[PDB]
Amino acid sequence: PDARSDARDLTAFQKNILTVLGEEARYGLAIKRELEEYYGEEVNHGRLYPNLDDLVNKGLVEKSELDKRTNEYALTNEGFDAVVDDLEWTLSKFVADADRRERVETIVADDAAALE
Amino acid sequence: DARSDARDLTAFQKNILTVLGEEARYGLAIKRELEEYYGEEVNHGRLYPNLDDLVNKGLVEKSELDKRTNEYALTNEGFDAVVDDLEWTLSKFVADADRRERVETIVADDAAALE
DNA sequence: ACCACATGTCAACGCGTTTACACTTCGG
DNA sequence: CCGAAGTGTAAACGCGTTGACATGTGGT
Ligand SMILES: [Mn+2]
Ligand SMILES: [Mn+2]
Ligand SMILES: [Mn+2]
Ligand SMILES: [Mn+2]
Ligand SMILES: [Mn+2]
């Protein structure tokens, strides 16, 4: 299963969900909150869960049960490949000269600093 | 703020800005590059409304190349939108040392492709 | 028991796309 | 001139969202 064949037709919402899960696996409403933080608005759970269900059916997300009212969503191996593939495309178009590159380098350096 | 523009746009539109972040191009050149990305035919009836909409949002400038050809380029605002989305994806991808070194090798390979 | 939490589900609604027809412009 | 290039554009159409109802769980 190639993640490219399955992840280039996803909507911005779905791709943002995968990026959130790229940080760490999360239960439903925790994803909602982090999406809400990115969008600056409220995200309707009636939109989240069906989109999580779609990503599951596409093979990009696994749905496990923490307790029998809570599910934990996480990226499959194909899901992580989808996140990597999207980043390699974004970068291949952004890294157009040396200034663009070092900009990315300081971004990644600052990100690694926040992790300590 | 760069976030407020980037968040709303659709995937199709951000792909337009990613394309333009590499280089300013004319309409059908954007079309062909997205057709290579999607691996599907891209309807021009879909592209031109989207580029124009991105102009009304102040993220793309529409200039005259010929009087049958337009050149589309990123405004400084559109660039900040591209950079902000890049920063968010990276902020959530660089979760440990291996993730960072993965991004470093990608960026290094990209830089070596420049010549 | 109480009442959050967590997720399920849907159809009226919103909205962008598809699929056309259409124009003016440049090359040979 | 004649065809392709390049872009314009609108209505049927497809298709995901909105905003709500809904169930069942876990905590206190
Ligand atoms: Mn979606
Ligand atoms: Mn909600
Ligand atoms: Mn990709
Ligand atoms: Mn093509
Ligand atoms: Mn076309």
The CB-side HSE value for B20 (13 A sphere, CA atoms) comes to 30
- Long-range contacts of the stretch B85-91 (C-beta < 8 A, 24+): B85/A90, B85/B6, B85/B14, B86/A90, B86/A91, B86/A94, B86/A104, B86/A107, B87/A107, B88/A19, B88/A38, B89/A19, B89/A86, B89/A87, B89/A90, B90/A87, B90/A104, B90/A107, B90/A108, B90/A111, B91/A111
Bases of chain C with protein Cβ within 7 A: 5-11, 16-21, 24-26
Cβ pairs A/B, distance under 8 A: 101
Residues of chain A contacting B107 with CB distance shorter than 8 Å: 91, 95, 101, 104-105, 108
Strand C at less than 7 A from CB of B67 = yes
**Cross-strand partners of A62:** A74
Q: Which residues of B are annotated as a binding site for Mn(2+)?
A: 37, 50, 104
CA of A36 to the centre of ligand 1 (A): 15
Alpha helices, DSSP H, located in A8-72: 12-23, 28-39, 45-57
Instruction: Tell me which ligand sits closest to the C-alpha of residue A55.
Output: 1
Provide, for chain A, the percentages of residues in helix, strand and coil under a 3-state DSSP scheme, each rounded to the nearest 5: 65, 10, 25
Look at residues A53, A56, A54 and name the one whose alpha carbon lies nearest to residue A76.
A56
**The Cα angle at residue B67 between residues B22 and B19, in degrees rounded to 5:** 15
Contact yes or no for A87 and B83 at CB 8 A: no
- Phi, psi torsion values for B109, nearest 5 degrees: -65, -45
d(C-alpha B85, C-alpha B7), whole Å = 8
d(C-alpha A27, C-alpha A68), whole Å = 12
**Cross-strand partners of A57:** none
Number of H-type helices and E-type strands within chain A: 6, 3
Parse chain B into domains and list their residue ranges.
1-115
**The Cα angle at residue A5 between residues A4 and A10, in degrees rounded to 5:** 80
Q: Which residue has the tokens 């409304």?
A: B49
Question: How was it solved?
Answer: X-ray
**Cross-strand partners of B73:** B61
Q: Which two three-digit tokens encode residue A27?
A: 């239960």
Strand C at less than 7 A from CB of B92 = no
Q: Which residue has the tokens 């980043």?
A: A87
Q: Which two three-digit tokens encode residue A11?
A: 């909507």
Q: Tell me if A74 sits within 8 A of A21, measured CB to CB.
A: yes
